[PDB]
Each structure stands twice: as C-alpha cells, then as structure tokens.
Design a protein around this nucleic acid. Structure first.
Lengths: 589, 456
RNA sequence: UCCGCGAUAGCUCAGUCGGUAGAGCAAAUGACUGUUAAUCAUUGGGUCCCUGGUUCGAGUCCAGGUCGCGGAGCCA
C-alpha cells in the first residue's frame, strides 16, 4: 500500500504524511542524522532520520544499497541552503516515522548516474539493474507515451488493430529470412516476416477499409550501427484513398503525437520532390536544419580550359555543383585538407575551392589556384547565382552525378554541423515523386521500391518512355533521417502487366514469385495505399538518445546476440532430432 | 575421410632487371614508370632471358634436390587479357628448369614429413587492374617480373601440413635469398588443389582449385572450410563440379569466381624467339659449392653437435644471419646453452625495439663474445653479467665481491622500509633483497639465503 | 601478412633502464547533526590474456598462441 511516488513529491503536499516504497539508491551516514535516497519509477526523493526514534535508526543503520524498503514519514520543507537542483522533488524532504525492509539486496554490480565508468558490455550483461537508472526508465516510459498517443490517434480515426501471424512462408529476392524448422513438416520451414506488407494487402482485399498494426519485424542481414535484428514497425494501410489523404492523416498523426508528448508544434510539412531534393541537397533524406544548399553550375563551364570541370560538364552522366559556406573564409588549410579527405571517402577525385574576399576587383579578388583557367564573366555570374558575398568560401564538386550528390551532400551536412550553421528547431518534411526505374549495374531496368508501386502516368505514357515516369511513393524525413515510408499500390490489370512487360519478367517468374499475390489481386482488390514507420528510430529521435539500443528494453549487440541471456545458446540432441535437422560440427584431423 | 591436396606456389625472384626486359623490379606508386619497350610488347621487339634469374632457378633446383634437366625450353601460354601485353605468357611446358625434388617439412606432430615437388619452372608476371572510374586502369609495372612456379606433388594431405609446407618453402627461399618472402608486399603467392575422398572407394569428390591465398592462417582456414564443404557435397551427392574458387577472410566463405565449363586450351608450343637454355653440370658444380646450409638441417645440426633443445635450435635457426651471428659467439667458446641464451633474451629486446632486418647492424658478435669472455675467464659468473648487460649493449664499447660485508648492509635495509613488521607473514621476501641488491650493485645466491635466514 | 593501441580486484585504470598486484569507486568495521557523486581512518579481496622459455627472482624480457578497436595490403 503506497501513498505517493517518491519522484512526485511537490512542495504542495507539506504537512501531510506519506508512505513510499522503493529502492535504496545511496545512503549517507552522519551519525546524528541519516540520509536515504529512495528511488522509484518516477524518480528519487530524500528521507531523513533523526535518532529521536532510535528504533527507526536501528532500521536505518542496517539498510544498504538497493534494499527494497517501505518508509512512512512526514514531508518537511528543507532550508534554502539545502535545496537540490538535480532532484525533481529536491526542494522537500521526508522525516521517517516508521521503516520496513521489504527485501534485502546484494551489492549492485555497477553504480547509477555518472561518472560511474560502466562499459557497454557490462551494462548489457546486467540490463535488469541498468534500467533502474532514471534516465533509461524515462526513455522507455517516453516510448510508452508515444505508442499510447499513436494508438489513440489511429483508433479515433477508424483504424482496426488486427494481428497478423509471424510464422509465414519463406521466399528469396528481398532479404534473408529467419527460418524455423518444422516439427510437423520435416524438411519445411516457417519464416519471420520482414513487414506485414503482403498481409496488409490481403487485409485490404478482405474488405477492412483501414488497417494499422504495431508489429515485430525480423531481418537476417549483417547489421549496421543503430540497426538490430528484431525491430518494431508501425504498419499502416488504407483503402479508397489517394496519396494526399494518406499523407494528410499520417502528417496529422505525427503533429498530434509531437504535441501530446514533447509539446512542440510543426506548422505544416513541406512536400519536396525527389528530383528537387537531389538537385539542391544530393540526398533522398535532406536535413532541413542546415540552410546550406547545393547549386548546379556545370552549364557555363562546358568549353573551359580547366579539365576536371569541363570533363563532367560535357558528360551527361554527371554534374558540377557548388556549395557556398558563409563567413568561412577564415577557415584554416588543415580543416580544408580534412574535408578533402572526407569527400574522398565518397569517391570524389577532388574538392575544388574558391575563397571569396573582394568582389569589386574581379579575378585579383578571388584567391584560389583554379581561378586562372576560368573567365571573369562566368565567375561573376556564378558568384551571383550561389548567393555569395565578402568573407565566404565556395566549394566545388565535379564528377558523376551519384558521386557529387553524395560527397557534396555529406560535406554539406558535415560542415553544416561543424560550423553550427543550423536552427535548433525541429524540421520535418515529405519526400515525394521518386523515379520508377534504375539501371542494375550490368544493364537493363529495375524498380527501386517494388513493382507494385503506382506510377503517376498512364500505362501508355509508361510504355512510351519508362524513364520519364514518376512513382506515387513517399518517405517521411525528420532531421535528415528517414522515419519511414510507403506508397499506393497498383490494382490495375493492364497496369500490372505494363510494368511487368517493361521489366523483362515473363509469366514463369510472375507465377513462381508472385503467384499467390496476383491470385489474391485478381479476385477484386480495391484502391489501396500504405506506409510504415520505424518505431524504434522514432522513439530514438523523440528521446534524443544516441543509439537505438537505448530505446529498446532488452536489445542485442551488433552481432545479433544478447549478452544477458547468453542467447543464442546450445540445445540438446533430442530437441534437435525431433525437429528433423542435423548439425555439422565434426572433428577434423 | 582422406583429403588429398596440392600446392601451386608463385615466388617473385629478387632480381634487379626483369626476366626479359631491362626495367627494374621493386616499384612504388608511380604507374607505367617501370616499363620499357619490351614489356609493352611493341611490334618487332624481342625478349632476352635474364642471367641471375636462371641462376637462382637452378639454385633452388639444387637446394631442393631435384633432377635438373640439361636443357629447358620456354613455351607460350596463349590467353587474352588486358594485363597480358603480347597475348601469351612465356612459361615452360616441356622440360622445366627443375623437376622432381623433395622438401622436409617440420610440423608439431612428431615426425618431420617429406613432401614432393613435381617441378619449379620460370614464368613471367603480368599487369594489374585497379578500382577506378566509366572504365578501368591497367598498370604494367609488375608485368615482366620474373616468377618461379614451385608446383608440389599431391603428397601433401592435411591443412596444417600445407601450412607447414608453405612455411618451409618460405624459409628455404628466405635462406637462398631468392625472394623477399614478405607476403604483405605481394611477393610470395600460392594456390591449393584440394580434393577429398572417402577411404575405400576409388571414386571421389571433384577437384577444387582455390586461387589467390595470402597468409598462412588464410591457407589453413580456407583449406579446412573447403574440405568440409566437399565432404558435405559428396555426402549429399548432388552435383560435383570443378570450379575456380576464392576465399575472403571477412566471411570465411568460399565463393566461385569462374565456373570451369571446359579445360582451358592455352595452346602450348616451344617459343621461336627463345632458344633452349642448356644447363651444364659445371654450373651446378659451382652453385652447389655456393649452396648455403639448409635451415631444416641447421636446427638439426644445432641438435646434434651443440647441446641444445628443439625449441631453441629452431628459433635460433629462424634466419641465416642470426645463426651465423650465434655460431661466432659459440666460436668464442661461450657455453652453447648460455651463449644462445644471451642471443635469445637480452639482445632480443633491443632487436625488438627497432626490429632491424639484419643483426649485422646493432651488435657485433665479437662484443657479446667478449662479454661472455669476461664472464667466464676474467671474472666469476653472477652479478658482473647484470650491469655490463645494461651498459655495454646500448652505448659504450668497453669491457664481483663475495665477502661477509653484505650482512652489514642487511640491517640498514630493514631500517629503511618498515620491513620489521612485514616479517610476520611468509609471503614473498624479494623486497628485502631488493634494497641490498640496489645498494651493492653483489652475490645473489648468498644474499637470498642470508636474507631468508635473517627474516624469520 | 603487416603497423599502432589494448587484456591487470566488483567497476575504471596506472605500473621506469627486470625486485610482495597500487589508486579512485565499491565493500566491511569505526568516527562524525545537513549531506545531497558526503568525508576520514582502518580492514578484506585478485590467475597481471594462455603456453613454453630467460633470470637469484617475473605484470615487466624472449618465442609461439587467443580476443577486442582501427589502419595498411591483396581481391590473376
């Protein structure tokens, strides 16, 4: 029977007695006065003991670290010189009337709060006492608040929380499936889903107008930092809706969520085309906090003596883009070399530059080794175009389109953060209008997303010139990171056959790879479209956490194993035999 | 299961000029700077065989105890690839330089097994392709570089044995001074012809040729992971196909670069430009006199005549320079075990400090020889070693009490540190001898007993 | 294969040109009436990454292995 939470002791409850249960954080013994810091889910509070009731003192001297205790006392208003900023309840104390030790505790491996030098492996191995730390708990509770808000919104807007099975059928092409040996069907396997995509589409076929699900997803790929094998995703699919409606509902959701939890507001989300994003940022996930923008200038540098510019300037398969960084002419050559080496890692042969100091003197007003091979007029209209003035530096990326886009895009974000050139507000956005196809190294055409993505044009303008086709696909970006995305699917016979014809796939593969899907599609599928969010990263952003493991209760390391439960582990030969499988760890000479 | 493997080792000979060209061998980042007209296969140009190339060839032939042919003819290996300029690789089809030899490889399972080498002929290297823009870039700096293809008889079995053979080849070549041996720079390379078979049936699994294998660890792991793969393949039956596989140390998996659809017809025939080189028994008579002492037999010579253990003999015979350097000090008459001892531990530390390629640089054998000379005859053995060890090796080059006095030193030490209180428990009494040794340097053997008697 | 760094109490980490594994924190005992990352005194604890070798003696020096981070090289 608890009266109040430790970390919810405001100043208003003065003159009231309270009973609070929790753990013993740290204990201070002064002899004449004993201090206890009791901690629960809401935070820490201080309880003070004077030996005027020396029995409680006897029940105060034995108490050690992390003891689970229940204390009843009165909240006394602490002196002005004793107030604590770090403690949220740190302007009041509680004098302990009676104490009881609910349970004893062995010494906690590691200490809570810094600079206790825990290392990540030890923190993961004893994760059950690590989550006692108020910061981790705040992160997880925040996650709970997020899922709460999202569920409330989606429920209120007529979506149905329906569960889809995890054990499904394995198939290649997309990614490595986690397999599950079948006890009842020897030689056959179940497979963990990569996304409830197919199932949600079936649910659209099934007549359910609006579907949502917070589902578990599994990928057997080698992983990146901020990447885990088991990750949670917010799946959403709707019927009889176009892209505007879907983006509307979803955007509204994100705003309402950010205002419910963090209490921030987002105005409106600008819709930016893929083409524009690639043009002025060189990335499909632009960081709209950094105002710095890439500006194309290769057209006026075609017939020029300097050859690393003119080369790609006359080559259609690439461009020459410039990047103005303001007030950064004072930058030292060391940093310049560092940046050249940085853009080096994305394939750029070189990072050309111009330090712009005095515009009215022309060429002797532009200190740089490149200025000699380029005419004064072109220079001046370039400087005019990029928006540069006195005191600035202009960088130059001149190569194949992909390379310059990536290298200058990254140089953009890097020098963006390094010089603190951003507004510290939240900056959300939508990326729309992707291309339909791309070349696949060897040749030919292929769909980037899925062959089921709706093109903006008709199957005739499509079979005309497939390269001019834009897709009805959409990704949502926040702080330059991709929160998620989806698209409206094709339900048209002649259209599905059009994209099928244009990709080189005959009916053999159509049947072998997508037969059951096409089957389900043939029996009367409605206009439907969807999107999915990576819930983990969303919570990671909303918390301000460094890694994704910080927003997952019991995460796994980069090699897919978790050190706490020592999984994966070994299994006895019996269970191995009953599942119709064999090992192959045989002794060699 | 019985695993029969083979090894095709390409060794880069350390010659100044190329085998048929006049360009240098060792090269830097500068591309096409080490290529004259001959290497570029210009029309009308002609090749001329290198002297020290064939010299080192028949040298390796003599070292490996192989029947060397009196005559050897260079043949053409016609295949088309951008790295190969003239469209054919000047190798040797019939009558190689050296043929049918044997190498004694020392392993850790007792017996030092004998392995066979079917041949070891002279080849030529080609260009290198690089990751760049688009198109690609071919550099002919290593093209025209003389190569020695040591092909081993398929007598080699287990993977550990294979590693032993690669190490033995590496050691022998290092001793002969033919190749650098440094696999990191890309001098010594090898391929493995692994094929497994169930004991009892003359039928067996398909042959697997794993090409481009760097380190010894890579060799072992790849050969194992290929053997087990073939075992599974024959157990299941399936399709046993002959393929050209590769190994990446990152995933420890074997991937097939090219599937061998058919036997590559390289169209071998005697080269009309190169006349058959005749190696007469006089060449071999002089070169055999020039032949250095084999390491495998050197550690055994360190076992037989000089009192030594297998370990110390092997690690001392790890290189010719160290071996000679040590043998000189032994020539001083410094005790075998103790002289070798001084070679191993003491100077070895400073040798680890710089890791100087040749021990001819840091310390002369006459100096350490002089030290042991002072330790044996001029002075008694003990503390005199300890200080001279510090002073003599590093800087200056210039070359003992046993009384009762140490007792007078033993009391004051007890007064320095609070050692009177630490006497209660046995533990370790080295700290007591420390102060006395530092105050004197004298006579540790007497000091240990005296301190032990004085403690409790 | 090669270069640099690293493995040492519950946690973190130091250790010379070779002589009982120290220090902070934690733990145990004791002291102290305002701390709040309490302090101070005292006590207890450990296989110096594994093996072999060197020396009177090893965390330290020699040789050969294991593991973590990053770089180089190779990828006819």
């Amino acid at each position: 029977m608890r009266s109040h939470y430790c970390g919810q002791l405001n100043e208003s409850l003065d003159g009231q007695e309270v009973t609070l249960c929790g753990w013993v954080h740290r204990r201070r013994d002064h002899g004449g006065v004993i201090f206890l810091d009791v901690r629960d889910r809401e935070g820490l509070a201080q309880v003070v003991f004077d030996p005027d009731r020396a029995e409680t003192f006897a029940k105060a001297d034995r108490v050690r670290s992390e003891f689970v205790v229940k204390i009843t006392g009165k909240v006394r208003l602490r002196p002005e010189g004793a107030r604590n900023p770090n403690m949220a309840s740190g302007s009041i104390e509680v004098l302990g009337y009676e104490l009881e030790v609910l349970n004893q505790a062995e010494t906690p491996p590691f200490p809570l709060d810094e600079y206790s030098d825990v290392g990540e492996e030890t923190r993961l191995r004893y994760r059950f006492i690590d989550l006692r730390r108020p910061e981790m708990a705040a992160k997880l509770k925040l996650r709970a608040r997020i899922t709460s808000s999202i569920r409330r919104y989606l429920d209120d807007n007529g979506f149905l929380d329906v569960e889809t099975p995890i054990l499904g059928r394995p198939t290649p092409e997309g990614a490595r499936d986690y397999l599950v040996p079948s006890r009842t069907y020897p030689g056959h396997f179940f497979a963990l889903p990569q996304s409830p995509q197919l199932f949600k589409q079936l649910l659209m076929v099934a007549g359910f107008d609006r579907y949502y699900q917070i589902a578990k997803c599994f990928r057997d790929e080698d992983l990146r930092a901020d990447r885990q094998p088991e990750f949670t995703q917010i799946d959403i699919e709707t019927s009889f809706l176009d892209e505007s409606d879907i983006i509307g509902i979803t955007e509204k959701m994100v705003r309402q969520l950010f205002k419910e939890v963090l209490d921030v507001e987002f105005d409106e989300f600008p819709h930016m085309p893929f083409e524009e994003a690639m043009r002025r940022y060189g990335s499909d996930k632009p960081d709209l906090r950094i105002p710095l923008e890439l500006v194309d200038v290769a057209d006026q540098l075609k017939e020029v003596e300097f050859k690393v510019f003119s080369g790609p300037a006359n080559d259609p398969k690439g461009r020459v883009a410039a990047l103005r960084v303001p007030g950064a002419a004072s930058m030292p050559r060391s940093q310049i070399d560092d940046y050249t080496k940085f853009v080096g890692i994305y394939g750029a042969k070189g990072l050309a530059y111009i330090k712009v100091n005095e515009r009215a003197k022309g060429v002797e007003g532009l200190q740089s080794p490149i200025v000699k091979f380029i005419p004064e007029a072109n220079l001046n209209v370039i400087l005019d175009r990029v928006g540069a003035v006195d005191g600035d530096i202009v960088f130059f990326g001149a190569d194949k389109a992909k390379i310059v886009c990536d290298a200058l895009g990254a140089l953009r974000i890097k020098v963006g953060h390094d010089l603190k050139l951003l507004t510290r507000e939240w900056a959300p956005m939508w990326v729309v209008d992707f291309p339909m196809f791309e070349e696949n190294d060897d040749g030919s055409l292929s769909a980037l997303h899925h062959p089921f993505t709706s093109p903006k044009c008709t199957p005739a303008e499509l079979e005309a010139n497939p390269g001019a086709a834009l897709s009805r696909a959409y990704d949502m970006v926040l702080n330059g990171t991709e929160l998620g995305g989806g698209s409206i699917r094709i339900h048209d016979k002649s259209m599905q056959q059009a994209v099928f014809r244009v990709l080189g796939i005959d009916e053999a593969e159509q049947e072998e790879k997508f037969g059951f899907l096409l089957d389900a599609l043939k029996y009367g599928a409605p206009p439907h479209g969807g999107l999915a969010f990576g819930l983990d990263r969303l919570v990671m952003l909303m918390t301000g956490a460094s890694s994704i493991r910080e927003v997952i209760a019991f995460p796994k390391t980069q090699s897919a194993g978790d050190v706490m439960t020592q999984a994966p582990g070994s299994v006895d030969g019996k269970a191995l035999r009953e599942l119709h499988i064999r090992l192959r760890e045989q002794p060699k000479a | 299961w019985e695993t029969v493997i083979g090894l095709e080792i390409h060794a880069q000979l350390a010659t100044q000029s190329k085998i048929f060209s006049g360009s240098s061998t060792a090269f830097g980042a500068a591309p096409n700077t080490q290529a004259s007209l001959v290497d570029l296969a210009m029309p009308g140009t002609l090749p001329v065989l290198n002297e020290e190339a064939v010299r080192m060839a028949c040298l390796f032939g003599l070292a490996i105890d192989a029947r060397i042919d009196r005559q050897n003819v260079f043949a053409r290996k016609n295949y088309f690839y951008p790295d190969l300029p003239k469209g054919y690789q000047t190798s040797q089809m019939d009558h190689p330089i050296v043929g049918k030899g044997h190498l004694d490889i020392t392993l850790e399972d007792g017996t030092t097994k004998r392995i066979g080498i079917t041949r070891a002929h002279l080849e030529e290297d080609a260009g290198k392709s690089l990751h760049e823009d688009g198109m690609s870039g071919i550099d002919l700096n290593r093209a025209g570089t003389p190569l020695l293809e040591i092909v081993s008889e398929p007598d080699i079995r287990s993977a550990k044995e294979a590693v032993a053979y690669v190490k033995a080849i590496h050691a022998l070549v290092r001793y002969l001074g033919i190749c650098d041996g440094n696999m990191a720079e890309g001098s010594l390379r090898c391929d493995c012809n692994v094929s497994v078979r169930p004991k009892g049936q003359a039928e067996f699994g398909t042959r697997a040729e794993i090409k481009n294998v760097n380190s010894f660890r890579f060799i072992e792991k790849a050969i194992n992971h290929e053997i087990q793969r073939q075992i599974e393949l024959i157990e299941d039956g399936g399709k046993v196909v002959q393929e050209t596989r590769l190994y990446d140390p990152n995933k420890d998996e074997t991937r097939s670069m090219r599937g061998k659809e058919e036997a590559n017809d390289y169209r071998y025939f005697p080269c009309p430009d190169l006349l058959p080189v005749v190696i007469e028994p006089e060449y071999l008579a002089k070169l055999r006199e020039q032949l250095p002492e084999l390491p495998v037999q050197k550690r055994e010579r360190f076992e037989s005549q000089y009192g030594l253990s297998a370990y110390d003999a092997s690690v001392l015979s790890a290189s010719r320079e160290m071996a000679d350097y040590f043998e000189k000090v032994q020539g001083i008459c410094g005790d075998a075990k103790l002289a070798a001892n001084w070679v191993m531990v003491e100077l070895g530390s400073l040798l680890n400090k710089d890791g100087l390629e040749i021990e001819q640089s840091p310390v002369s054998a006459e100096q350490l020889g002089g030290m042991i000379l002072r330790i044996k005859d001029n002075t008694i053995s003990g503390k005199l070693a300890k200080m001279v060890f510090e002073a003599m090796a590093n800087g200056e080059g210039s070359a003992x009490x046993x009384x009762x006095x140490x007792x007078x030193x033993x009391x004051x030490x007890x007064x320095x540190x609070x050692x009177x209180x630490x006497x209660x428990x046995x533990x370790x009494x080295x700290x007591x001898x420390x102060x006395x040794x530092x105050x004197x340097x004298x006579x540790x053997x007497x000091x240990x007993x005296x301190x032990x008697x004085x403690x409790x």
